[PDB]
């Protein structure tokens, strides 16, 4: 998946390819594979921000629970996007946090 999205360009990839990532995102979520979940989540977040939609991604986070056992790089990818959208919405003081972690992790 990390490559799949990557090369991709537009709708059929942002939209048609996104519907899949959310699909098995749910599937794997019930399958309890931490790594693949977190990765996929990151990919669709990155999609929202290749788009202009912060809100959709924000309320997306609102219904999200992130898992444990991770790869610190993916962990910082998350904390990065998180901090960012968290910032654009004006709330700074919690953005510094997630970005600081994006430096640590």
Partner 1 sequence: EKKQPVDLGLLEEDDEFEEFPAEDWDAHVWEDNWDDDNVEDDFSNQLRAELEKHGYKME
Partner 2 sequence: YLSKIEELQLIVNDKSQNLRRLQAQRNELNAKVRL
Partner 3 sequence: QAATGMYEQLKGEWNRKSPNLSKCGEELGRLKLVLLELNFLPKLTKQQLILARDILEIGAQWSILRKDIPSFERYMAQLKCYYFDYKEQLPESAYMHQLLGLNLLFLLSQNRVAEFHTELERLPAKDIQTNVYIKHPVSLEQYLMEGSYNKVFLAKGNIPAESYTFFIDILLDTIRDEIAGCIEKAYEKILFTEATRILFFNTPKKMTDYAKKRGWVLGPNNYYSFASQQQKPEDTTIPSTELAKQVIEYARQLEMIV
Selected range binding partner 2 among 7-15, 29-37, 71-79, 94-102, rule: CB under 8 A:
29-37
List contacts with partner 3 (CB under 8 A). 10-11, 15, 52-55, 58, 88-90
Does 32 help bind partner 2 (rule: CB under 8 A)? yes
Q: What angle do CA 91, 92, 97 make, to 5 degrees?
A: 115
Q: Looking at beta carbons only, is 73 or 89 nearer to partner 1?
A: 73
Is residue 30 involved in binding partner 2 (CB under 8 A)? Answer: yes
Residues with Cβ within 8 Å of 52's Cβ and at least 6 positions away in sequence, in order, are: none
CA distance 94 to 87: 8
């Amino acid at each position: 998946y990390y490559y799949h999205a990557r090369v991709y360009e537009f709708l059929d990839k942002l939209d048609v390819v996104r519907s899949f990532l959310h699909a098995r995102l749910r599937t794997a979520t019930l399958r309890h594979d931490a790594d693949g979940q977190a990765t996929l989540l990151n990919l669709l977040l990155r999609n929202y921000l290749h788009y202009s939609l912060y809100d959709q991604a924000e309320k997306l986070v609102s219904k999200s629970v992130f898992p444990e056992q991770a790869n610190n790089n993916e962990w910082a990818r998350y904390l990065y996007y998180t901090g960012r959208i968290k910032a654009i919405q004006l709330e700074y003081s919690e953005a510094r946090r997630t970005m600081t972690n994006a430096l640590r992790k």
